[PDB]
Design a protein around this ligand. Structure first.
Ligand code: GTP
Ligand code: MG
Lengths: 182, 585, 142, 415, 9, 165
């Protein structure tokens, strides 16, 4: 049940890899502890398939706070699909890497956030605006040191008003989360 | 009409409570329409489906007359479902149940013993006080029959008649003559239940029924040396319900009589030693044996055997047996008081047990085992148990602390300290009817009033969220402010009590919405009573009485209007009616 | 004296109720719901007796179906466990390897088994063969 | 800002689970159910339940519970609007949202729940453009996720360009037991079915009282709408400026308008029921229904739901027009006529039987509710004057309109 | 589950 | 259908020679925190390479990466004499388990273009690969900007992928 799924997930070929990830998502969805299967599904993360990437992203979203000291092995894959030419995978990576609520990897993902607050695609721009508030709720001191609040204030003034709406919601969240200085 | 199994299946195929209720009402409509057409064939299955409806929790008030019609019919299955429906639907307060006294009386003279036992079962289960008067002679004529099947049910009917109408108790006297000489154990069990019912109900026949104590001893004797039987036997021992009921009857007789206890003492020693303890059934027999031994006036040498059997019940690892040992040691506390006190370390060991019932009877056993020797020694553990508990236990713990410190106080200063400790720590879990007892013991503490008034003042000066604490404290401050303050008519050296912040915190519990509108009356009567005893501040008690004369609380408004009238017109009369009272007992 | 006997499942829904005391229907449903939540708010190691309004409630689990009895403060709790076990054995000897489904679909037969064993809150037939035999002759009596 | 959105069942176990902020502990969902029963026991049931610092904002569908959590002062109107919006999104993604449809569609429900909300904030909630890039059978994101026109996609074509308009009126009526009308309002709905190519600019023309008084033609027939609710596509600033309903419509079926007005005209179907209730014997119903609209109109499938006692039995029905059957599941009788012309008054008589033993608890009095529907008929008087369809390619599309008047909350109180 | 024997054997 | 593992240290040229095996040119690479999974079609055998980073907080995550691999690639930087000793400690701890016995071993000494570089024998008898048994080892002279060594490394993995011709 566990070792057989571990060996089937540690195999090579793609559709049974996708079915192993699909049944580990389904066994989380029926409500059992499956966090011991973490590196086998984390190892199949850079894939050309996007449904498989979404399910591995979902497992990483709800199973990285339970294993904080060992979920560090996804950051280079996160910054490597934060730079792909698909903006759906770029914004999905930004949205997922904002949701990894551990502290010692958030300094390693400030550079893809700085790259994705700047690019011409408004979908990944309005995702990076909310990811600024996610990283502020994680480490407000690291966000104030990196200077994301100044470029979130600059995202009020740009065009494409969903970017300015997400920047308004993020800056309002940061403003009530602030100690009312500056 | 659909069958009962199809209705049960249709109920089990429902998905939610609302859709279940719709199909309940859809079946009940067809059942009531079949009832309106007076159908004789399917009335049995309709009443049975309505009984399933009433078991699920739905109205079945329209089937009571059909239950009476099923009782009044001639078919046995109709009679069975009708008597079950009478038992399930009618009761004493239903008032349709009076209309089947004639039907039960007709079925008691039936030729069929199963119809007779059906009527006996329904009457003994749920017969009212009005049914038991005109059917008691019909019960008593079935108590003299040779049929054992009717005899045991007529005996339990006599139990129900005696329990319901206890002035029809003397008319079952000749029915119990040579009733213990029957051989079958169900009839013997119901006879023993009947004899202990009249012996518990009335004490005039205790010596009358004590002459069958050696007969009960001989029945228990051949019951114990009945080695193996394939009937009346569970887990290797024979007749446990009969043995426990016989030992309960032998507990009921002989508790104040000596010679029945000498006639019963040898078989009490024989049962208490020669029965097994490896099973729950033998543990039940030993628990009823030790209850019989410690309730009758038994021999003091085997009282030590009862101590040893309660000890090996106490260090049993089974939680049922530990509950049984705690309940038996709670059952005998007033007798052998020296012999309960050695188990106190084990009792406070199960006081910290995880089980709710174990720690509840351990708390009640520690409260019953509080005496005047090392009352401090149990008192630190009882306050530890109060301070470190899940908070359903705090009201009973604080109440038991109140009667323990009331009954066994060595000194008034320690009593004041422990009642302040339990008032500050328990707080809102203190029951509000104990506040007259607390005020009564404080007023009876005549030689010290200033220390307890200062401690109540310092406790409220921390917080006043605890309503019985502030209700004691406001009354004590208003009665004893004249020695709460001392020599403070003018400005003096800085002392921590300076006759203003006491009235400010009384003002605070008056203004705050976190008061229960009784402690506001306590604080207003305190502030009025402080007007006689304070000679420094003037025209402040008057205005705080005056602004409360238009309150939405009617008792507070009436009190403040009367006190404002006394202040405005009869200010010279307040010392005549606001003086201290002598104590009461 | 046994005051009432309750049978219920893990879902809290009632399977059988017999009452030897008289009290109204709203108080009946309230007492049954709070007693079911008291029993179902307890573990499997919790000593099988609860205290409830000077009545010790003797309960014992057998399957998903629970069995419960309420006695006064003079009876034996372990013999009430034996009374519950004797009622389960009478259900065994009538139905034959009884499950919850026989109780659900023959609640009136389980009621007849309780009436042949307990009337008035007290035991009438102590033995096992006599009560089942009386139900068998009343079943072929018709 | 919802911390986590859950889908549950009647037992309250988690069917599918989604975390957005993580400030609420994820295992607090098992505390939602006994808080719900203990608030239903005291009669203090609320849509917002609290467990210390965690607030449970929940809605209830036909089969499921949709619960949102928060640790802070959340915008609870935004949360409930989001919950009903993803109920609508799942209802267009699947046939019907039940307990079963979560389990086989869990991958696309996870993708949808990632797409719909980001960190407590709703992002993309249109199902028609949401189906363009996440499917159950993934490309680049479309421009219409982030464009100013967020409801309508570019590049869709139709061979026949048609707009279908459904001006649906819902008459809400509440009368007293004495027979006087205390509430009589019309809530309207313009449901539009758009099959158009390109980027059309649509201009809806109505007989608005404010528009007619501002123009100067306010002598003809017009409706005085008390409040107007518009879709996201409608230019609200220019509607306020010059009463102009200008919009680029979404593709397919959508509700453009929901207006509201109060009318002093007589109710369309009037019910007079006199109850001849006898204690422990019988209850008698004498119900007369008259249609007070015009004789050329005809109400179809009217159902006059009249409540009966729950312990009643053996119904005897006398009627002139229609059929009346007993529905004891709802503890009522409905009187179904198939065609109700205007100016006609019909009679119904119903007799039940009552038990001699009274019930333990009181019953309560639901009102009489009727369920009429009058097609080719409007009761307020609103007419669609035009629908100017302007496109840069240039075509002639055909706007089709129809007017349906149906019941809303059409209640009549009993004795 | 419901079709399971009541006695423990 | 076959799996290898490529591990090493910081600034070993590791992801750059992985992407040179992938496409052929060297791209700008950051220090790799997680992993890189790339496949390369070369002489009709699919070669899936599992590059894992080698930072100080990153090293004890390799215990899952030893599962289901029968080839090993070790990349050793040739300029940093003070961390050859912790490379020694890392190799002697990494080859001290009971799981990965059936895998071959490949040493990738790099940066043999600058005049501070050296040959490939003093590193070999300094590391002491003769003290460990049941393994195939030798070392060739590779470089970053020349691309040599990698193609004969794939030929090495080819002719002890199988036992036949
Ligand atoms: N272009 C080029 N760069 C080299 C060469 N040798 C070393 N580098 C340097 O090595 C770095 C890449 O090293 P990698 O093999 O990716 O190792 P790393 O940077 O520590 O990253 P990880 O080990 O995966 O954590 C580059 O940033 C270069 O600065 C070379 O021969 N050519
Ligand atoms: Mg490297």
């Amino acid at each position: 049940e566990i070792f057989e799924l571990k060996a089937e997930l540690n195999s090579d070929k793609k559709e049974k890899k996708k079915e192993a990830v699909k049944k580990v998502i389904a066994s989380m969805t029926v409500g059992k502890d499956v966090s011991a299967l973490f590196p086998d599904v984390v190892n199949c993360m850079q894939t050309d398939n996007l449904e498989l990437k979404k399910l591995v992203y979902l497992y990483l979203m709800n199973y990285a706070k339970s294993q904080p000291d060992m979920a560090i092995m996804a950051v280079n894959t996160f910054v490597k699909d934060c730079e792909d030419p698909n903006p759906l995978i770029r914004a999905l990576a930004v949205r997922t890497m904002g949701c990894i609520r551990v502290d010692k990897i958030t300094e390693y993902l400030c550079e893809p956030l700085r790259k994705c607050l700047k690019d011409e695609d408004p979908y990944v721009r309005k995702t990076a605006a909310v990811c600024v508030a996610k990283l502020h709720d994680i480490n407000a001191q690291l966000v104030e040191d990196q200077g994301f609040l100044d470029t979130l204030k600059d995202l009020i003034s740009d065009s494409n008003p969903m970017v300015v709406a997400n920047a308004v919601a993020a800056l309002s969240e940061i403003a009530e989360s602030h100690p009312s200085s500056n | 009409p659909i069958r009962l199994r199809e209705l049960i299946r249709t109920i089990r195929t429902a998905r939610t409570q609302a859709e279940e209720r719709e199909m309940i009402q859809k079946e009940c409509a067809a059942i009531r329409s079949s009832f309106r057409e007076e159908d004789n064939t399917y009335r049995c299955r309709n009443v049975a489906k309505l009984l399933y409806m009433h078991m699920l929790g739905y109205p079945a008030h329209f089937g009571q007359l059909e239950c009476l019609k099923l009782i009044a019919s001639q078919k046995f299955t109709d009679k069975r479902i009708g008597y079950l429906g009478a038992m399930l639907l009618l009761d004493e307060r239903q008032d349709v149940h009076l209309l089947m006294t004639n039907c039960i009386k007709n079925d008691l003279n039936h030729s069929t013993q199963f119809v007779q036992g059906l009527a006996l079962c329904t009457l003994g289960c749920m017969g009212s006080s009005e049914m038991c008067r005109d059917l008691a002679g019909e019960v008593e004529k079935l108590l003299k029959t040779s049929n054992s099947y009717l005899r045991k049910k007529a005996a339990l009917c006599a139990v129900h008649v005696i329990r319901k109408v206890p002035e029809l108790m003397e008319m079952f006297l000749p029915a119990t003559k040579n009733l213990l000489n029957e051989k079958n154990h169900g009839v013997l069990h119901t006879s023993v239940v009947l004899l202990t019912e009249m012996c518990e109900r009335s004490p005039d026949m205790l010596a009358h029924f004590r002459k069958l104590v050696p007969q009960l001893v001989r029945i228990l004797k051949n019951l114990i040396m009945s080695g193996y039987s394939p009937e009346h036997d569970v887990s290797g021992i024979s007749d446990p319900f009969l043995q426990v009921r016989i030992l309960r009857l032998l507990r009921i007789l002989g508790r104040n009589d000596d010679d029945s206890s000498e006639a019963m003492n040898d078989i009490l020693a024989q049962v208490a030693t020669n029965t097994e303890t490896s099973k729950n059934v033998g543990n039940a027999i030993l628990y009823e044996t030790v209850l019989t031994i410690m309730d009758i006036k038994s021999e003091s040498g085997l009282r030590v055997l009862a101590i040893n059997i309660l000890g090996r019940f106490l260090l049993n690892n089974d939680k049922n047996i530990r509950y049984v040992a705690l309940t038996s040691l709670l059952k005998t506390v007033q007798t052998d008081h020296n012999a309960v006190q050695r188990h106190r370390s084990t009792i406070v060991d199960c006081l910290k047990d995880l089980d709710v019932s174990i720690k509840r009877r351990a708390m009640e056993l520690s409260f019953a085992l509080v005496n005047g020797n090392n009352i401090r020694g149990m008192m630190k553990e009882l306050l530890y148990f109060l301070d470190s508990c899940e908070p359903e236990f705090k009201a009973d713990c604080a109440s038991g602390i109140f009667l323990a410190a009331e009954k066994y106080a060595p000194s008034k200063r320690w009593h004041i300290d422990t009642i302040m400790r339990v008032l500050t720590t328990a707080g809102s879990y203190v029951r509000d009817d104990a506040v007259p007892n607390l005020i009564q013991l404080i007023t009876n503490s005549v030689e010290m009033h200033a220390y307890t008034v200062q401690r109540l003042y310092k406790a409220i000066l921390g917080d006043y969220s605890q309503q019985p604490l502030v209700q004691v404290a406001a009354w004590c401050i208003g009665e004893y402010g004249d020695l709460l303050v001392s020599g403070q008519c003018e400005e003096e050296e800085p002392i921590q009590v300076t006759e203003d912040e006491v009235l400010d915190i009384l003002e605070s519990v008056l203004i705050s919405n976190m008061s229960t509108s009784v402690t506001r009356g306590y604080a207003l009567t305190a502030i009025m009573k402080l007007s006689t005893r304070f000679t420094c501040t003037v025209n402040r008690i008057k205005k705080v009485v005056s602004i409360y004369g238009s309150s939405i609380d009617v008792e507070l408004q009436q009190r403040a209007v009367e006190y404002n009238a006394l202040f405005k017109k009869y200010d010279h009369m307040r010392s005549a009616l606001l003086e201290r009272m002598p104590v009461m007992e | 004296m046994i005051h009432f006997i309750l049978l219920f499942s893990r879902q809290g829904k009632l399977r059988l109720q017999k009452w030897y005391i008289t009290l109204p229907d709203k108080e009946r449903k309230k007492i049954t719901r709070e007693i079911v939540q008291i029993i179902l708010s307890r573990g499997h190691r919790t000593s099988s007796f609860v205290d409830w309004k000077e009545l010790k409630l003797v309960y014992k689990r057998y399957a998903s179906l629970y069995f419960c009895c309420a006695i006064e403060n003079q009876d034996n709790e372990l013999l009430t466990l034996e009374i519950v076990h004797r009622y389960v054995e009478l259900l065994d000897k009538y139905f034959g390897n009884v499950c919850e489904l026989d109780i659900i679909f023959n609640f009136e037969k389980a009621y007849f088994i309780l009436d042949e064993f307990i009337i008035g809150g007290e035991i009438q037939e102590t033995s096992k063969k006599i009560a089942v035999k009386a139900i068998e002759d009343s079943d072929m009596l018709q | 800002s919802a911390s986590a959105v859950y889908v549950l069942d009647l037992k309250g176990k988690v069917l599918i689970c989604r975390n957005y902020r993580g400030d609420v502990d994820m295992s607090e969902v098992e505390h939602f159910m006994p808080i719900l029963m203990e608030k239903e026991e005291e009669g203090m049931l609320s849509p917002i339940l609290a467990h210390g610092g965690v607030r449970f904002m929940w809605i209830k569908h036909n089969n499921l519970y949709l619960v949102a959590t928060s640790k802070k002062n959340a915008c609870v109107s935004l949360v409930f609007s989001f919950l009903y919006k993803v109920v609508q999104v799942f209802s267009e993604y699947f046939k019907e949202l039940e307990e079963e449809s979560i389990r086989d569609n869990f991958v696309i429900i996870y993708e949808l729940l990632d797409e719909l909300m980001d960190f407590g904030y709703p992002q993309t909630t249109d199902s028609k453009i949401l189906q363009e890039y996440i499917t159950q059978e993934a490309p680049r994101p479309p421009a219409t996720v982030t464009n100013a026109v967020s409801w309508r996609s570019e590049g869709i074509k139709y061979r026949k360009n048609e707009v279908f308009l459904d001006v649906i009126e819902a008459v809400n009526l509440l009368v007293s037991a004495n027979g006087n009308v205390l509430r009589s309002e019309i809530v309207g709905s313009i449901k539009m079915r758009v099959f158009l190519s390109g980027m059309p600019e649509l201009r809806l023309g109505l007989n608005d009282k404010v528009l007619f008084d501002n123009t100067g033609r306010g002598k003809s027939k017009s409706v005085e709408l008390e409040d107007v609710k518009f879709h996201q596509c409608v230019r609200l600033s220019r509607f306020e400026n010059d009463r102009t309903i200008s919009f680029i419509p979404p593709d397919g079926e959508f509700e453009l308008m929901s207006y509201r007005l109060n009318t002093h005209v007589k109710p369309l179907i009037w019910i007079e029921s006199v109850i001849e209730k006898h204690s422990h014997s019988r209850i008698e119903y004498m119900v007369k229904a008259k249609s007070q609209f015009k004789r050329r109109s005809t109400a179809n499938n009217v159902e006059i739901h009249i409540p009966v006692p729950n312990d009643a039995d053996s119904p005897k029905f006398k009627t002139t027009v229609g059929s009346v059957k007993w529905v004891p599941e709802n503890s009522e009788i409905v009187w179904s006529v198939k065609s109700f012309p205007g100016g006609k008054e019909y009679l119904m008589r119903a007799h039940f039987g009552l038990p001699s033993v009274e019930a333990e608890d009181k019953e309560g009095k639901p009102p009489i509710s009727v369920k009429f529907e009058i097609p080719y008929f409007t009761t307020s008087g609103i007419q669609v004057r035009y629908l100017k369809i302007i496109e840069k390619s240039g075509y002639q599309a055909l706007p089709w309109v129809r007017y349906i008047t149906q019941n809303g909350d059409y209640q009549l109180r009993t004795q | 589950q419901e079709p399971e024997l009541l006695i423990s054997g | 259908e076959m799996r290898i593992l490529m591990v090493g240290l910081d600034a070993a040229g590791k992801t750059t020679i992985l992407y040179k095996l992938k496409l052929g040119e060297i791209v700008t690479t950051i220090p790799t925190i997680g992993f890189n999974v790339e496949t390369v079609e070369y002489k009709n055998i699919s070669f899936t390479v599992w590059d894992v980073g080698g930072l100080d907080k990153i090293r004890p995550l390799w215990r899952h990466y030893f599962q289901n691999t029968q080839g090993l690639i070790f990349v050793v930087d040739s300029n940093d004499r003070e961390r050859v000793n912790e490379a020694r400690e890392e190799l002697m701890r990494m080859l001290a388990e009971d799981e990965l016995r059936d895998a071959v071993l490949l040493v990738f000494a790099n940066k043999q273009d600058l005049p501070n570089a050296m040959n490939a024998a003093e590193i070999t008898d300094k590391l002491g690969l003769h003290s460990l048994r049941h393994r195939n080892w030798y070392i060739q002279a590779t470089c970053a900007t020349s691309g040599d060594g990698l193609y004969e490394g794939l030929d090495w993995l080819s002719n002890q992928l199988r036992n036949q011709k």
